[PDB]
C-alpha cells in the first residue's frame, strides 16, 4: 500500500485553533508549498492543534506522471454515400430548356423536386441534356432535360473527431483526501488550479515538457481506442485528401446535417439517358484509424491513449520533478479527542533509501474501536498516522530514509500514551 513521501509541518502563524465544546476547532488560512511525489507517492501535510496528541495528515496521492494534450482546432468527419434521383422530362414541357439546364444553379430548386421537401441535409440540384425524338423516350426532336437531386447520407453508425495537439501539458492526477475522510480525485496541469472543499491546489515549478506536436493528427473514437496520423493538421478541405468533408458535432455526421463544410463540386455524375450512376471518392477514415491506432512508437517516446480523462497522453521515461502549492481559504477543521487503545506489531520492510519513492513499511494495527494511530520517532522527524478500525488490520504506507540499515525506534500511540516499537529492514540504493 502506498503512503506519504514528503512529510512537512504546517506553519502555526497561519493556523489558529480554539476550544468549542470540549474539543479543538482549528482553522486553515495560508499558502504552503510541498514537493510533489513520484508514481505512487503522497503529499502529506502534518497539522498540529492546540495540544501535542493531535496529528492529522492531508494525503494527496499521486497516480502517475502523464502529459495531457491541448486541443485548439478540431472538427468531426465520417463516411457518407450519395443518394441521387432520376427525373427525365421532355423538351417544351413545363420548365425544360437548353439555357435553363446548361446554366442551372445548385441553390435553386426545380419543379420536379420541390414536392419532395427541403430537408436539413447536404442536397443539391443538377441538370444534364439528353437526346430527343421517339428513339429516346419523347415525341420531340429537341433535347430533353434530366433533373438530378443528390443528397448525402451517412451509412455508418459511428463518427470520428479529428484534432491535434499544440503543447503536451504535464498532467498529474492527484487523489486529494480530506481530513474528515472525503476522498476526491482531480488533476493539475502546467499551472492551473482546482477548487476543492478545503481550498485550491495548483502545480508550481515544472520541467517535464515535450515539444513538436504540431506535425501530428489524432482521431478520437467514442467508445473505442484512439489513433494517430503522421501528417500535419488539415486546414483546407480539398478534393483527394483526408479531411475534405468536415462538420461540427457527432449528430452532424451521423445524420448528415446541412451545416457541414464540404468541397465544392465533389459529386460525380454520369448521365446515360435513363441510367444514372452517382459515385464519390471519399477517403474512409476507418482505414487510417485501423492502420495507425494507438499505441504507436514515435521517436524516443510512447504515445498512448487514456483511461480516466478522455484525451491524448504521452509516456516519457523519468521521475517526477515538480512542486505543489496548497492554498487555504478559511477552512474549519475539527477533531475529537480519542481514548481507545491499540497494540501495533511489526510486519516487514521493503523499499529504498535516499530515493524518490521511499521505504514501504507495514504494521499490524490491532484495536477494539474505530480511531486513529499517531506514531513518531525520537528526534521528531518521522510521523506515522494510519487509520485504526475494530479488529486486526494490516495498514501499509511509504516512509523515507537515508540509511540502508534502518534501526530507528518508533513510539506509537492511539490516545496519548506511547509504546516502544522497533523496526528493521534492508533497503536498496536507487535514485
Amino acid at each position: 500500500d502506498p503512503g506519504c513521501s514528503e512529510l512537512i509541518q504546517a506553519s502555526s502563524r497561519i493556523t489558529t485553533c480554539s476550544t468549542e465544546g470540549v474539543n479543538t476547532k482549528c482553522r486553515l488560512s495560508g499558502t504552503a508549498l510541498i514537493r510533489a511525489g513520484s508514481v505512487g507517492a503522497e503529499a502529506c501535510l502534518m497539522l498540529k492543534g492546540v495540544k501535542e496528541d493531535q496529528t492529522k495528515f492531508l494525503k494527496i496521492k499521486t497516480v502517475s506522471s502523464e502529459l495531457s494534450c491541448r486541443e485548439g482546432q478540431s472538427y468531426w468527419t465520417g463516411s457518407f454515400s450519395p443518394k441521387c434521383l432520376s427525373s427525365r422530362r421532355c423538351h417544351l414541357v413545363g420548365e425544360c430548356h437548353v439555357n435553363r439546364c446548361l446554366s442551372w444553379r445548385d441553390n435553386e430548386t426545380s419543379a420536379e423536386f420541390s414536392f419532395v421537401g427541403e430537408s436539413t441535409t447536404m442536397r443539391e440540384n443538377k441538370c444534364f441534356e439528353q437526346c430527343g425524338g421517339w428513339g429516346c423516350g419523347c415525341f420531340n426532336v429537341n433535347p430533353s432535360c434530366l433533373f438530378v437531386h443528390t443528397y448525402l447520407q451517412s451509412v455508418r453508425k459511428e463518427a470520428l473527431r479529428v484534432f491535434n495537439c499544440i503543447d503536451w501539458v504535464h498532467k498529474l492526477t492527484l487523489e486529494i483526501t480530506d481530513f474528515d475522510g472525503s476522498v476526491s480525485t482531480i488533476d493539475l496541469g502546467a499551472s492551473s488550479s482546482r477548487f476543492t472543499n478545503w481550498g485550491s491546489v495548483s502545480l508550481s515549478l515544472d520541467a517535464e515538457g515535450i515539444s513538436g506536436s504540431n506535425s501530428f493528427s489524432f482521431i478520437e473514437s467514442p467508445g473505442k481506442g484512439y489513433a494517430i496520423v503522421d501528417e500535419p493538421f488539415s486546414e483546407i478541405p480539398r478534393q483527394g485528401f483526408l479531411g475534405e468533408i468536415r462538420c461540427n458535432s457527432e449528430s452532424s455526421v451521423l445524420s448528415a446535417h446541412e451545416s457541414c463544410l464540404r468541397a465544392p463540386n465533389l459529386i460525380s455524375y454520369k448521365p446515360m439517358i435513363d441510367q444514372l450512376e452517382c459515385t464519390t471518392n471519399l477517403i474512409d477514415p476507418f482505414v487510417v484509424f485501423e492502420r495507425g491506432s494507438l499505441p504507436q512508437t514515435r521517436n524516443d517516446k510512447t504515445f498512448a491513449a487514456s483511461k480516466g480523462n478522455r484525451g491524448v497522453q504521452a509516456f516519457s521515461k523519468g521521475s517526477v520533478q515538480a512542486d505543489l502549492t496548497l492554498m487555504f481559504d478559511n477552512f474549519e477543521v475539527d477533531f475529537v479527542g480519542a481514548a481507545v487503545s491499540c497494540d501495533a506489531a511489526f510486519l516487514n520492510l521493503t523499499g529504498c533509501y535516499s530515493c524518490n519513492a521511499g521505504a514501504r513499511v507495514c504494521l499490524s494495527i490491532t484495536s477494539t474501536g474505530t480511531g486513529s494511530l499517531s506514531a513518531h520517532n525520537k528526534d521528531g522527524s518521522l510521523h506515522i498516522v494510519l487509520p485504526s478500525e475494530n479488529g486486526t488490520k494490516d495498514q501499509c504506507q511509504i516512509l523515507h530514509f537515508t540509511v540502508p540499515e534502518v534501526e530507528e525506534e518508533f513510539m506509537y500511540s492511539c490516545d496519548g500514551d506511547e509504546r516502544p516499537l522497533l523496526v528493521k529492514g534492508t533497503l536498496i540504493a536507487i535514485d
Binding site: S29, F195, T196, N197, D329, N330
Partner: protein, 301 residues
C-alpha cells in the same frame, strides 16, 4: 409547445399577512384579475430569469407551501416608533420601487421572509426606504428580487458563503478583515438551502432535466394561440377522473388521451423540470435561487 407565463403550479397564491387585501384576484392567480404582485414579474427587460423559468414557484408560493420560513414580524412597519428591525438587513439592498405600490418584500439574510409597508396614507419612494405622499395604493407586495423557487427538502447546513475577496456581504460577517472596507454595490447571485442561511455564491451552474411531472405540460382549451386550461383536471394513464384531455406523444405517453372525447389539446411545456445548482463542485438541490444587487464590502488595504 411554448409554456404560458401565468399558469402557476401548485396552489398559485401570491399574498402575505397584513397586505392580503388583494386575495380576490391573487388567490388563485389566473387570467381573470390583475394581481399586483405578479404583473411586474412578467415585464420584458426587467426579470429575465423569471421569464426563462415559467413553470416554477416564487418566494410567496414557497411561503404558502411551507418551504421558506417566515420572519417575526413578517410585515414590519416603516413609520413605527422604537426603531424598525426590518431595515438593518434591507438598507444594504439596492432595490428600485416604481409607483402606486405601497408594500414591498425581500429575502433576508436569515433565510426567512420579511416585508415592509407604509401606513395609510403613504406609499414607497425611489430608494424603497421611507414613505412619501402622492395615485391609487395597490394593496399587495412589490417584489424586489428575480428568484425562482421549487419543492425540495435537501439539507445543506455544511455550506456557507465562501467568496474570494469579500469581507462582509449584507449583514453576515464572513472572514475577519483587519484592514479597510470597500463599501460598494455590485451584482452577485445567491442560493438558499434548507436549514441554513442566505448563502452567496460568485458563480453558479444551472441544470435542467425533463421528467414526467404534472408541472411540465401545458394545455390549450377548446370546444368539444388559444387560452389556457387547468391541467389538474386531466385524467391519469390507466384510469379516469373529472374531464378529459388529449395531446401529442409527450402527453399521451404519461396520461390518457381520449382523442375526440377530450376538451383541451395539451402539449409539452418547454420550460420546466427540476432545476439544480452546483455549489462547491457538488450538485445539490437548492430552494430559491435569485440574482439581486447587494452591497459587497470588499478589501482595500
Amino acid at each position: 409547445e411554448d409554456p404560458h407565463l401565468r399558469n402557476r403550479p401548485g396552489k398559485g397564491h401570491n399574498y402575505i399577512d397584513g397586505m392580503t387585501q388583494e386575495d380576490a384576484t391573487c388567490k388563485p392567480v389566473t387570467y381573470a384579475g390583475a394581481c399586483s404582485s405578479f404583473d411586474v414579474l412578467l415585464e420584458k427587460g426587467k426579470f429575465p430569469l423569471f421569464q426563462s423559468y415559467a413553470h416554477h414557484r416564487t418566494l410567496l408560493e414557497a411561503v404558502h407551501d411551507t418551504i421558506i420560513a417566515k420572519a417575526d414580524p413578517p410585515s414590519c412597519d416603516l413609520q413605527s416608533a422604537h426603531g424598525n428591525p426590518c431595515m438593518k438587513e434591507k438598507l444594504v439592498m439596492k432595490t428600485h420601487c416604481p409607483n402606486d405600490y405601497q408594500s414591498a418584500h425581500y429575502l433576508n439574510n436569515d433565510g426567512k421572509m420579511a416585508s415592509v409597508k407604509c401606513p395609510p396614507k403613504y406609499e414607497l419612494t425611489e430608494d424603497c426606504n421611507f414613505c412619501r405622499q402622492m395615485a391609487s395604493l395597490k394593496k399587495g407586495s412589490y417584489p424586489l428580487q428575480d428568484l425562482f423557487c421549487q419543492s425540495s427538502e435537501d439539507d445543506g447546513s455544511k455550506l456557507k458563503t465562501k467568496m474570494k475577496g469579500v469581507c462582509e456581504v449584507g449583514v453576515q460577517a464572513l472572514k475577519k478583515c483587519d484592514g479597510q472596507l470597500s463599501t460598494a454595490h455590485e451584482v452577485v447571485p445567491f442560493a438558499v438551502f434548507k436549514n441554513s442561511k442566505k448563502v452567496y455564491l460568485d458563480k453558479l451552474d444551472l441544470k435542467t432535466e425533463e421528467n414526467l411531472l404534472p408541472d411540465s405540460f401545458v394545455c390549450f382549451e377548446h370546444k368539444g394561440e388559444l387560452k389556457s386550461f387547468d391541467i389538474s383536471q386531466c385524467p391519469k394513464i390507466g384510469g379516469h377522473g373529472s374531464k378529459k384531455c388529449t395531446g401529442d406523444a409527450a402527453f399521451c405517453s404519461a396520461y390518457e388521451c381520449t382523442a375526440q372525447y377530450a376538451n383541451a389539446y395539451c402539449s409539452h411545456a418547454n420550460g420546466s423540470g427540476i432545476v439544480q445548482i452546483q455549489v462547491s463542485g457538488v450538485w445539490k438541490k437548492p430552494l430559491c435561487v435569485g440574482y439581486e444587487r447587494v452591497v459587497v464590502k470588499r478589501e482595500l488595504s
